[PDB]
Amino acid sequence: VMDVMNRLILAMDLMNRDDALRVTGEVREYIDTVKIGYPLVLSEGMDIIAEFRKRFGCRIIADFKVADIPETNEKICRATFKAGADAIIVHGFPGADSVRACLNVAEEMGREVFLLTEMSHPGAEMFIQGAADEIARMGVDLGVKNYVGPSTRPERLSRLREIIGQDSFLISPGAGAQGGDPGETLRFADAIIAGRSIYLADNPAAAAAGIIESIKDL
Amino acid sequence: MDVMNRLILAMDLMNRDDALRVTGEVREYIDTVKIGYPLVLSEGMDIIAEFRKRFGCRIIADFKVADIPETNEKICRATFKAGADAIIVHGFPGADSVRACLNVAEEMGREVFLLTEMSHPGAEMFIQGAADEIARMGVDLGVKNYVGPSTRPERLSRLREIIGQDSFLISPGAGAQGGDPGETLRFADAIIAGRSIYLADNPAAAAAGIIESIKDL
Ligand SMILES: O=c1cc(O)n([C@@H]2O[C@H](COP(=O)(O)O)[C@@H](O)[C@H]2O)c(=O)[nH]1
Ligand SMILES: O=c1cc(O)n([C@@H]2O[C@H](COP(=O)(O)O)[C@@H](O)[C@H]2O)c(=O)[nH]1
Known part of the structure; x- marks a missing residue:
């Protein structure tokens, strides 16, 4: 499975190049895996993936x-x-x-x-x-090895982990802004996704470091 | 929404030159183009403005x-x-x-x-x-525009029943996926057509043919 640094994936949903690049660069010592979605792609083009690879060498989901x-x-x-x-x-x-x-x-x-x-x-x-x-x-049954399930419903996340087994890779959004708890989520998910709790912070690097501190024993 | 000839082009070609050429070839037959991720992820969101500049078509x-x-x-x-x-x-x-x-x-x-x-x-x-x-x-939410399947006219008819005759309903699946244009238009306001037009030997003749087949509608 992919080796996600600090079990933490940045959801980079800012919608302009300059801000997206600034924030991603600021947290690069903590995060090597970046989730890029349509908010950014529809605003800046698919070439944003190329620019992130060039500038940060992060994995891109x-x-x-x-x-x-x-x-x-x-x-x-x-x-x-x-x-x-x-x-x-x-x-x-x-x-x-x-x-x-x-x-x-x-x-x-x-x-x-x-x-x-x-x-x-x-x-x-x-x-x-x-x-x-x-x-x-x-x-x-189809042989899928990688899954996404919800941080906001620990009970459901636990069941999904059971179904897919311990060898499958599971990532989970919903901690932070949507109310899920990072540590509890990591009982079941291999990595958590974090968007607003990082990219809207006054200091995104401090925000990332804080999330990591809160789950340090894991 | 007033869709010319009850026919919406699904422009799922993945390069700008081909997409613009083919859309141009059928422009006399349509005024509504559905642009999806195959074209947008290949050529960028600016393609939408380009279609408006070249064709003055409605874009879904x-x-x-x-x-x-x-x-x-x-x-x-x-x-x-x-x-x-x-x-x-x-x-x-x-x-x-x-x-x-x-x-x-x-x-x-x-x-x-x-x-x-x-x-x-x-x-x-x-x-x-x-x-x-x-x-x-x-x-319940006040939605007025809907999409349902040409490949299952009994399901399309049920969807029409639920939303009422006042709502607007468009339907993909005629042609390449096996649906029939005329049957589909018993229930939908307009049909979507992709491959049956843009992969045809002659896209203009293909569009003309579809329209000929639903002429009485
Ligand atoms: O069930 C899901 C699936 C998602 O991909 N997402 C995505 O994960 C991210 C959550 O970001 P945030 O930490 O700001 O709530 C967003 O990009 C959202 O689109 C989610 O929130 N819930
Ligand atoms: O249920 C649906 C909904 C869709 O939008 N579509 C879309 O409608 C178009 C159908 O194209 P075609 O005529 O080549 O089968 C495609 O762009 C497809 O993504 C569909 O086929 N089925």
Whole structure:
């Protein structure tokens, strides 16, 4: 599995190049894995992945929550890996063919898929939560090795860890701004994602160091 | 939304030259283009403004928005800043995520389309069982524009029943995925067509042919 420094992944959701680069550079001594999503990509272009690699040499997870039909999913994955992303995040709720399309491209291109099972926000309870255990089991059956599950619901995160097993890699958003607890989340997740609690801080480096201090025994 | 010939081009070519040429070849037949991530991630968001400059077409950004509310808001803002007239949003992540998109659309003078059931086989696993409830959620939220599947006209008809004749409904899956344009337009206001046009030997003739087949509609 990927070796994520300090079990901490930066969610870089700032929407201009200058700020995104400044903050990422400020925390680079603490974090070697950066999640780049559509807020930044749709504002600055896919070449932002190239610039981050050039400036920081951090691993890049493209958080694109891929959620289309198989044919379109393949195109999205090919474009994303072409730009230099190490991995891409894909929704499971559109079903097994859509996930398999992404897995097939990742295999061909030598990259990785993360399967998003349950989400961390309140609305996830409406439809996603009731499908999540089955989505996870589907991932295991398809050979998925990397997963995303919610920091905001420790009980659900624990179940998802059970389903995927200890050898699978699990990352988790929702600690900090959304109310999850970093230490509790790391009982089950390999790494936590942190966005606003870092990038909105007066001193992002101090914020990152503080999160790390709070989980130092882990 | 007044869609010329009830036909929306799904422009999923992945290079600018081909995308512009093919769209130009069929411009006399359409005034509405759906641009998705295959083109945007290959050529950049500036492609939307370029389509508006070249064709003066309406642009639907098919971004299948499916994040938490805070991130959805950012995605919609970036998308509308790029000149999209409308954005397609998944309903599966729940009401708060949809509302976040509705808020930005209202602020910027744009439309949200709610995707309720998808057209591909995998949709049967999780989405289909939630789809009627997703549609009722749209009604509750005041959503007026919807997407449902050409490949399952009985499901498309049910979606139309739920949202009412006043709502606007567009539908992918005719052509390449096996749906029939005419049958689909019994229930949808417009059909989406991608590969059946942009991969055809002659895209203009392909568009003309689709339109000939639904001439009475
Ligand atoms: O279930 C999930 C899945 C996510 O990827 N995310 C993403 O993780 C990040 C959370 O950032 P924050 O720490 O600011 O709440 C955002 O990029 C969000 O889009 C999430 O919050 N919940
Ligand atoms: O349920 C859905 C929803 C979609 O937006 N789409 C989109 O509609 C278009 C269908 O294109 P095509 O005619 O080549 O099958 C694609 O851009 C696809 O991403 C779909 O096929 N099924």
